[PDB]
Design a protein around this nucleic acid. Structure first.
Ligand SMILES: [Mg+2]
Lengths: 488, 278, 121, 230
RNA sequence: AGAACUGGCGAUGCGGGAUGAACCGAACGUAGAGUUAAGGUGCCGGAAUACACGCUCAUCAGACACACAAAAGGUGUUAGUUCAUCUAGACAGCCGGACGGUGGCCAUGGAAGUCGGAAUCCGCUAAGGAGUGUGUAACAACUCACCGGCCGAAUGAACUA
RNA sequence: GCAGUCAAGCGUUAGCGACAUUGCUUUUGAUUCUUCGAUGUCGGCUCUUCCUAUCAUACCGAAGCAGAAUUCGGUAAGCGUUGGAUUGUUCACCCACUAAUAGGGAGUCUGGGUUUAGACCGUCGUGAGACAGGUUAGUUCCUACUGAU
């Protein structure tokens, strides 16, 4: 056990001597200050003293007649995010705080002796985090009651590995793509395959993309899009299980596909090509992007997170009728999508060649920015739920953060010692949890880009992790054949 | 150099080259050593053999590197032609890999020579020499694919045309099967196939003819199809690059007849869109 | 060698918290000529090193296309990749490349043997 | 110059009359020539010919087996697929290197009668703290050429070898005075900077150093090989 | 490396082993007769260029302290084991069929089977490969995988000495 | 080499193991400016003799060999394989010309040096004394061949 060099006699003498105090009640300095919304709104000039931050925050409330708390920052070289006011004209800025705060996950929990196989995938349910499902090498998928940390009915029916599993955004039907050729449907309480499995696929399923609720009309169930090594994406009707059309534009395996809020299915493929297929176009490609040196390994969008919740916000209150649920999904999608006034769902594509590309599929095919600061392939790239921050995981043992819109580099984490696998985003964007080839789980504080806490315990090869929608609990899984839960 | 670098020594594949080097080392060096010989003499013999093998490998690699046309900065037209023909990036990467292998061989030979001068028993020196040879073979072993690709491109590069764009030239271009190949054959004392299909002269054949007591060279190319500047083949890319880089006007041909069954509107639109080349 | 709870046992484990302090010290450490080192501490410099020097070297193009497919009888490169999207920009690129190229555009007694240094082992 | 036209010329003159017949006759005679050479190609050549023939036969057998099998007819995440992959020491009772010429004697002085000098002819690692003393004190001499700092390390897991700096030597059997001397002496257990692998023990305390045993003989080889004791 | 144990030289003549201080035999006085161990019986070299069953072509075979470059390889030879073909015509030799959807699907100026690649179907039979090769811009042109017309009695494949 | 992988065959018949095979094995012809304690007498002149694992000449052969010219497998020792250069060691590198200026053993006039000459500088020791270096001084017809009576 290495020891940090102990403080010398000089350090002891310095520590023994008292120093300044933080009461700061007297002689508050006054300097001119300006207010300007972080995104677009430029403005409320004042020259106040070194007053408490709460007073400054409440000052802007009456200006806009909102009563809502707003996150505050200034000088956006300085990069400054009484203590802040004593550093020196400071140009202050504001943005919504999203008062709902997800408490940091620090405490571990006992393991569950469920399916005896390496874990492959896992995802939290949108309606409530109390239920969770994990995929593993075993052909059978199992749901878990997070409250009691116990398994649920076993999804018997598959004869090969369940590559991908995830709840539908409405939570009505779970999809569990099988390795061999098929995807099966399981409602939360069926305990058995719901009808005949979706078959007729030449190769294994790579990823699944549910139809967003905000686009789903009342009554009709959401469509289920699938991707596979065959290089084609089939659109499946959850009710009739029939395929309306299949697109084979991709000449190689489709790495992943995301059902955008505008009805466009942004997908990447091993052919180093990105094709924006759209359901509304009767299964036709509207535009094609080709800028990656290597193939595309992952895809993500700013509004993708809002799709997976299916109007089930952090409160977890289930809607009454499909129409009001769709309306609440649409309003939330507009809120997240219309961050910069207009609805613009930014897209980012992960390139294995130590590079990532920022894309705006709704506009010209010229890339917005070429995010390129990694040393190894970026395994996973995901937009922040807020949308202003972008993070990526790579095999180079580091996690890099980038600006959501301008592409400017922000910071890089180096806590992980081995290859970093997929990561998860907190419901409030305040904390990011990442898992790596190393047998450790870590969470990073976005507020200052510092290591918050370490969560070891897994035997080895923690392949994937997810964050609950409400943020109460965080699940994990790895090759140890043991599911472990984490909570504040 | 320029103008038909065919003089490259057409290196044999990796296995053949390694076998040749080993045979040369065995033949050009003494073989019969005995334990009773003085340790100094045995060590000197082993060091001499190792140094000879290393020097042979280094000389081979250096000759291979030098013989190549030095694509970098050679010429924009020649650079683009080579990039189209052999995918410049791959060729540069293969040459860099060869240079790295040569450097590794040099380092291994130096390290083994430094270590070899301390072994006491004859068996120790023999084992050190065997390890050095195995290291050299392993370094050479991974070079099979780049060496084969370089041999293929050399077989193709040697027969490539040789013309200087800076000189006075006039070229012939147009739609394929317009009779352009026949026009090239007739205008200059050159032999080219005149078969009636749209890819008769796949390669950029060079023709030479004299007028006004001055030599005037010419080139050939099948031309360009619709080709909206997104989907172009290597042959058509070579023609586009040649037209862009080359000197004074290239003759644009048009088959105003039933043959070349593209509407004359398409022929007009082709040159209208290619206008920036003018 | 005797079996025991010895080697196959952990002996060099570093502390997780100390890594951040070591990284900060390495980033902030500075020295002058008047300051000299006597004992360089043994620490995992590999983890501390490799700071945010974002350069992202060139892609591994060979992985997408092998040497054999690039050229040869089994060619799989009928069309160039990343070629110019338009003729005008290609013409401009060729023009400026040509201009740059134009911008770039028996022997005396050999060396004396006295220069045997700093050769001469 | 003049690209692949040679094919054109062949097409315009068409496979000279005797060429096809001569080629067929040579191909027919190939088996007889190979059989005759099986008796020719004497010492230093017959061995190579036999090795090549054996390799060709093995390749043919393996290709025939593959064709016959074809004629009949560890789960990983979605992102790792399509990508490249009782405490006794592994080598107990190592060879008993004796106290012998390995301590090579170097004759000192103009008149070689008071050598008193011993030289270690075995690979040794020292590091930064070598600091050669005055020449008069060189009772034991470890040559620089025979000093190695990075030794190959491997484990029966993923078969990945990575060169890592040598940290120290803890226990050399057979008179561990060699341990005090830092000699490799295959069979020794040495510490290696395993920070590259980044394996983490229970409790979140990442490990970056483990003791490994030298597998190969650095005396008879220019490389050092060791296996992690995990 | 080391232990106990047996024999010879040590201290040793004699026949043979070209010769070898460690090999085979062998109980050392002077002579004669006859029989042998070891080596042999073409000459030096005293004894059959004796009988009988087979092998050995060797560019320096073979007669070599038997020790290892020694594992296979030879369309080199002699002899043997197992599995199938069979007069419901044994192997090999001359002649024809080798189809139809089809020019499969995606890659696309050309991949009609033989530059890329997933399975390789069904209809069809004595039999047909979305193809084994030779060669073509594109089929096209020719062969066998497999079958039949003539033959005409044993044949093919893997191993052992 | 280590640790595997496929497994022609042998297996107590669970293990071995021929050939292949993965990780050590600055991807942009960048420059590492690297050349790391050889304790030993050998080194270089001329001429002859022997081998081929042969550089030229000679023989023929396989090549994107169209020629010039070039890459290489094999037969072949018949005849050739030259000249300057360092020393602040020449355990070796440079370039005149040729078609090439091939690699060794069988040691055999000349120069370093292998040894007591005499001395010196520094090392080491209370000193004789000898060196981690080093310089100066040096001395070592018997038989067989070629001609003749
Ligand atoms: Mg034509």
């Amino acid at each position: 056990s290495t020891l940090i060099p102990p403080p010398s006699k000089k350090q002891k003498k310095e520590a023994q001597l008292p120093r300044e105090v933080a009461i700061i009640p007297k002689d508050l300095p006054n300097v001119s200050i300006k207010f300007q919304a972080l995104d677009t709104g430029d403005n409320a000039l004042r020259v106040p003293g070194a007053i408490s931050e709460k007073q400054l925050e409440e000052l802007l409330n009456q200006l806009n007649g909102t009563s809502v708390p707003y996150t505050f920052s200034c000088t956006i070289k300085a990069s400054d995010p009484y203590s802040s006011l004593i550093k020196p004209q400071i140009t202050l800025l504001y943005t919504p705080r999203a008062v709902f705060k997800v408490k940091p996950v620090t405490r571990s929990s006992s393991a569950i002796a469920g399916h005896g196989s390496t874990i492959l995938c896992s995802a939290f349910a949108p309606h409530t985090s109390s239920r969770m499902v994990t995929g593993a090498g075993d052909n059978t998928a199992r749901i878990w009651d997070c409250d009691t940390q116990t398994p649920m009915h076993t999804l018997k029916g598959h004869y090969n590995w369940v590559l991908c599993v995830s709840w539908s955004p409405d939570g009505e039907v779970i999809a569990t793509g099988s390795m061999d050729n098929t995807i099966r449907l399981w409602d939360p309480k069926s305990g058995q395959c719901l009808g005949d499995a979706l078959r007729g696929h030449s190769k294994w399923i790579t990823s699944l993309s549910w139809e967003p609720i905000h686009l789903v009309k009342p009554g009709s169930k959401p469509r289920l899009a699938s991707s596979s090594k065959d290089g084609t994406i089939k659109i499946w009707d959850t009710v009739s299980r029939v395929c309306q059309y299949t697109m084979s534009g991709h000449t190689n395996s489709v790495s992943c596909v995301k059902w955008g809020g505008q009805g466009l299915l942004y997908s990447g493929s091993h052919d180093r090509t990105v094709r924006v297929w759209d359901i509304n176009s009767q299964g036709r490609c509207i535009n094609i992007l080709k800028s990656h040196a290597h193939w595309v390994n992952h895809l993500s969008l700013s509004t993708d997170y809002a799709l997976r919740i299916g109007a089930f916000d952090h409160t977890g209150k289930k809607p009454s009728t499909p129409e009001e649920a769709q309306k609440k999904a649409l309003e939330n999608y507009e809120k997240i999508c219309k961050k910069n006034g207009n609805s613009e769902e930014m897209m980012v594509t992960a390139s294995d060649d130590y590079t990532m590309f920022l894309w705006n599929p709704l506009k010209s095919t010229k890339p917005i920015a070429r995010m390129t600061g990694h040393q190894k392939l970026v395994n996973h790239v995901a937009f922040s739920p807020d949308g202003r921050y972008i993070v990526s995981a790579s095999f180079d043992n580091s996690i890099k953060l980038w600006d959501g819109r301008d592409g400017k580099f922000i910071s890089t984490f180096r806590g992980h010692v081995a290859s970093v696998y997929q990561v998860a985003w907190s419901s409030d964007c305040r904390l990011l949890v990442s898992c790596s080839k190393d047998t450790t789980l870590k969470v990073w504080d976005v507020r200052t880009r510092k290591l918050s806490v370490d969560l070891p315990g897994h035997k080895d090869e923690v392949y994937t992790v997810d964050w609950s929608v409400d943020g109460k609990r965080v699940c994990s899984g790895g090759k140890d054949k043991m599911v472990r839960l984490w909570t504040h | 150099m320029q103008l038909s670098w065919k003089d490259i020594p057409t290196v044999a594949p990796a296995n053949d080259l390694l076998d040749i080097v080993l045979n040369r080392t065995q033949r050009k060096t003494p073989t019969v050593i005995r334990p009773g010989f003085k340790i100094t003499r045995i060590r000197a013999f082993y060091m001499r053999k190792v140094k000879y093998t290393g020097e042979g490998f280094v000389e081979k690699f250096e000759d291979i590197l030098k013989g190549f046309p030095n694509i970098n900065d050679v010429h924009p037209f020649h650079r683009d032609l080579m990039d189209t023909l052999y995918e410049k990036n791959h060729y540069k990467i293969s040459l860099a890999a060869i240079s790295r292998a040569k450097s590794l061989v040099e380092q291994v030979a130096r390290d083994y020579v430094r270590l070899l001068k301390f072994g006491q028993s004859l068996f120790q020196c023999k084992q050190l020499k065997r390890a050095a040879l195995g290291r050299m073979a392993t370094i050479v072993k991974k070079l099979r694919d780049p060496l084969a690709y370089l041999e293929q491109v050399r077989q193709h590069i040697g027969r490539l045309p040789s013309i200087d764009p800076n000189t006075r030239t006039l070229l012939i271009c147009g739609y394929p099967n317009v009779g352009k190949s026949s026009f090239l054959r007739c205008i200059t004392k050159s032999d080219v196939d005149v078969q009636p299909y749209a890819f008769t002269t796949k390669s950029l054949y060079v023709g030479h003819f004299d007028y006004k007591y001055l030599r005037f060279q010419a080139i050939d190319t099948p031309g360009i199809l619709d080709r909206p500047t997104e989907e172009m083949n290597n042959i058509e890319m070579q023609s586009i690059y040649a037209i862009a880089h080359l000197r004074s006007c290239v003759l644009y041909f048009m088959d105003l007849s039933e043959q070349c069954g593209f509407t004359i509107e398409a022929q007009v639109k082709l040159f209208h869109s290619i206008k920036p080349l003018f | 060698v005797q079996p025991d709870r010895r080697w196959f046992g952990n002996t060099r484990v570093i502390s997780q918290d100390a890594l951040q302090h070591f990284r900060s010290a390495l980033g902030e450490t500075q020295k002058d000529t008047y300051q000299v080192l006597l004992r360089r501490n043994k620490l995992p410099m590999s983890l501390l090193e490799e700071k945010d020097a974002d350069e992202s070297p060139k892609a591994r193009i060979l992985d997408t296309e092998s040497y054999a497919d690039a050229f040869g009888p089994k060619a799989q490169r009928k069309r160039p990749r990343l070629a110019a999207s338009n003729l005008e920009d290609l013409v401009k690129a060729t023009n400026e490349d040509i201009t740059k190229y134009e911008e770039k555009q028996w022997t005396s007694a050999a060396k004396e043997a006295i220069f045997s240094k700093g050769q001469s082992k | 110059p003049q690209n692949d036209y040679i094919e054109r010329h062949i097409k315009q003159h068409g496979k000279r009359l005797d060429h096809e017949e001569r080629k067929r006759k040579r191909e027919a005679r190939e088996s007889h020539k190979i059989s005759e050479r099986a008796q020719k190609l004497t010492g230093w050549k017959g061995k190579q010919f036999a090795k090549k023939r054996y390799a060709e036969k093995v390749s043919m057998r393996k290709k025939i087996k593959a064709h016959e099998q074809s004629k009949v007819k560890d789960a990983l995440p979605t992102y790792l697929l399509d990508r490249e992959q009782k405490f006794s020491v592994p080598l107990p009772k190592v060879r008993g290197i004796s106290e012998e010429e390995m301590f090579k004697v170097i004759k000192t002085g103009k008149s070689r009668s008071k050598s008193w000098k011993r030289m270690i002819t075995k690979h040794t690692f020292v590091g930064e703290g070598f600091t050669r003393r005055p020449v008069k004190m060189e009772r034991i001499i470890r040559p620089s050429a025979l000093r190695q700092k990075k030794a190959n390390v491997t484990h029966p897991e993923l078969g990945v070898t990575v060169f890592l700096p040598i940290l120290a030597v803890k226990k050399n059997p057979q008179s561990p005075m060699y341990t005090q001397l830092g000699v490799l002496t295959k069979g020794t257990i040495i510490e290696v900077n395993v920070s590259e692998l980044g394996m983490v023990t229970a409790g979140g305390k990442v490990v970056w150093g483990k003791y490994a045993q030298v597998t190969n003989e650095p005396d008879r080889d220019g490389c050092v090989n060791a296996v992690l004791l995990v």
